[PDB]
Design a protein around this ligand. Structure first.
Ligand SMILES: NC(=O)CC[C@H](N)C(=O)O
Lengths: 247, 383
């Protein structure tokens, strides 16, 4: 049963965003559900009344109802339980993604959008497969450390902390979220980090990613608003509304 | 190379062992007189502590298995098992493997945790819990960890929830729910920012600290005494003498102000402190001091899972955002929807002490990480 985890107070909001917190119940670890609180906050500052719904186990994803979809990281066990549930949501999420729906996926979330991921032990776990990437095994070793990337298409720099066993390998039709400046990012090759499909934003960044990078928070929420309310709309400037959150 | 002249109780779990153990001793001294225990922490080198009557040992999760080769305990007590920074279920099965070695023992568990539910051991199980009034089933807050039914694998709900994932749990598919409790906290009598008073199996006990997590420590202590046939009247007599182990509130007069200093370690701990100060009957200034290091947690991301969003419903005029990571905590505090104008980011701890000194409001709460608190505890001016 889907339920409304959060909502804006009543007020004078031009716009209306509906956020799907995919598996917020189970994928709640390492601070990364703070990303839900950052979207909400940023969306309110751009005149959106936010309504965050936990779409979780056994539920259905309404591809036509939601404007942003967030998919956090979780514990190994929880994540393999989720993996079994996912084929019910595959057609819905694919439609959402392909109709240019905005997504922010993190760690396990990111991995699970792809074809598969392999646990540290070596167990293969199938993902949605709405995307082309896979994530590979790393026995007894992690990519832990500070990290900085740059997305050449937005001339934007995102910073974070990474800590993951899996080694993600993007497909030919995917770009990374950015090129690595320092850190490991997606895999052993230290080239690319995360993903950027078409309004999908994957990453392994802890922080959480939207606290540390207000510029990505702004991009996600505006990309969503402009898609719903048309590209012509005029939103408060990045520097005007988020002045306090800018290094 | 050991003395087994002793009915012996071992106390393990991730949180609150020392308190539960220290309390259990004080209680049992009022029944058996001489109660044998071990100071601070202890692994296999507890023979030194040991060199008719009863002993109560604090044992480490890890070390347990080894020892249970040597000693043959009558009671195993698990206060609870939470994770820190797949690691819960392995330390549970580590303690559970030790307990197989001693099939004669009874195991006393926190019934309110789902993790303890039909343990795969032959031993007879006894449960303590908050047996409070059941409402209609509600989900726990989404950041609550460990909410899958241990049979159905589906999502648990709560007929009532104390804190974290503890309470009268129920899966609406499997049917699995919190088992019948053997030692019942039947009524939560009082609970403020400073005290809690509560009823367990006929008797009222109270602690002069507040915050609801501590009651579970008292419950475990009382439940042990009851398993050993102690009179509820003697339990109280000795409970009171040994209630010092919770400690007083650490309030400071700053000239004209009364400021209370409170520790935060982790999301569950922080939320617990927040829900405590929510109950204060007056307005106060909230200062949050965030440092990042070994002791305080190397990653500040944990504050994003702490339920600070509850401050908007409190009577708070001023906020200060201090400590080494002043910049990150101020952002956290903003994102609650608290008036951004009234959050005062503050480079230096001396400046925080001063803005409190010169505030117009009369009480001030300061939540701080371990080191931030030690630094601030340098009020080398007057304490
Ligand atoms: N928690 C994380 O940062 C990543 C989780 C992921 N399952 C891994 O490969 O480790």
């Amino acid at each position: 049963m889907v339920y409304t985890s959060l909502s804006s107070k009543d007020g004078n909001y031009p716009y209306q965003l509906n956020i799907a917190h995919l598996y917020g119940n189970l994928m709640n670890t390492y601070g990364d559900n703070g990303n839900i609180l950052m979207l909400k906050y940023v969306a309110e500052k751009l005149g959106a009344h936010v309504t965050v719904d936990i779409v979780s186990l056994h539920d259905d994803f309404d591809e036509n109802h939601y404007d942003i979809a967030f998919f956090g990281g979780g514990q190994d066990f929880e994540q393999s339980i989720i993996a079994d549930d996912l084929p019910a949501k595959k057609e819905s999420i694919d439609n959402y993604i392909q109709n240019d729906g905005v997504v922010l996926a993190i760690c396990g979330g990111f991995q699970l959008l792809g074809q598969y991921y392999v646990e540290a032990s070596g167990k293969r776990i199938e993902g949605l497969g709405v995307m082309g990437h896979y994530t590979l095994n790393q026995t007894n070793n992690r990519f832990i450390g500070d990290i900085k990337i740059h997305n050449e298409d937005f001339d934007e720099t995102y910073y974070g902390f990474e800590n993951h066993q899996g080694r993600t390998f993007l497909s030919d039709d995917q770009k990374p979220l950015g090129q690595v400046v320092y850190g490991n990012g997606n895999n052993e090759e230290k080239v690319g980090e995360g993903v950027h499909y078409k309004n999908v934003f994957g990453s392994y960044f802890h922080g959480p990613i939207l606290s540390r990078n207000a510029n990505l928070a702004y991009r996600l929420v505006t990309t969503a608003l402009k898609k719903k309310y048309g590209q012509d709309i005029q939103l408060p400037a990045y520097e005007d509304i988020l002045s306090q959150e800018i290094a | 190379s050991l003395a087994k002249n002793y009915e012996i109780v071992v106390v393990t779990g991730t949180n609150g062992k020392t308190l539960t153990t220290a309390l259990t001793v004080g209680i049992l001294k009022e029944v058996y007189g001489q109660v044998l225990t071990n100071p601070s922490g202890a692994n296999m080198i507890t023979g030194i502590a040991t060199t008719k009557n009863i002993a109560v040992l604090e044992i480490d999760e890890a070390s347990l298995s080894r020892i249970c080769d040597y000693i043959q305990p009558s009671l195993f007590v698990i206060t609870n098992i939470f994770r820190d920074q797949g690691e819960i279920y392995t330390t549970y099965n580590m303690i559970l493997d030790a307990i197989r070695k001693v099939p004669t023992a009874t195991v006393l568990l926190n019934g309110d945790s789902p993790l303890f539910y039909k343990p795969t051991i032959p031993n007879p199980i006894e449960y303590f819990g908050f047996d409070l009034e059941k409402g209609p089933a509600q989900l726990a807050h989404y950041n609550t960890e460990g909410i899958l039914c241990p049979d159905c694998q589906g999502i648990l709900k709560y007929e009532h929830n104390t804190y974290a994932n503890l309470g009268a749990y129920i899966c609406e598919g499997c049917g699995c729910k919190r088992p019948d409790l053997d030692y019942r906290l039947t009524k939560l009598v009082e609970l403020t920012n400073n005290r809690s008073r509560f009823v367990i199996d006929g008797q009222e006990y109270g602690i002069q600290i507040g915050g609801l997590y501590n009651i579970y420590n008292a419950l475990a202590a009382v439940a042990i005494a009851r398993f050993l046939g102690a009179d509820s009247q003697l339990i109280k007599q000795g409970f009171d003498k040994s209630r010092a182990v919770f400690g007083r509130q650490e309030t400071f007069h700053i000239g004209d102000k009364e400021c209370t200093l409170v520790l935060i370690k982790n999301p569950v701990g922080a939320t617990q402190a927040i829900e405590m100060i929510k109950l204060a009957p007056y307005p106060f200034s909230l200062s949050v001091l965030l440092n990042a290091n070994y002791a305080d947690g190397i990653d500040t991301s944990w504050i994003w899972d702490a339920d600070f969003e509850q401050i908007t419903d409190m009577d708070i005029p001023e906020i200060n955002a201090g400590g080494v990571r002043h910049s990150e905590i101020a952002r956290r505090l903003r994102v609650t929807g608290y008036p951004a104008e009234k959050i005062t980011e503050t480079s230096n701890l001396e400046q925080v002490l001063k803005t409190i000194e010169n505030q117009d409001c009369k009480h001030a709460y300061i939540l701080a990480t371990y080191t931030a608190m030690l630094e601030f505890r340098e009020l080398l001016a007057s304490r």
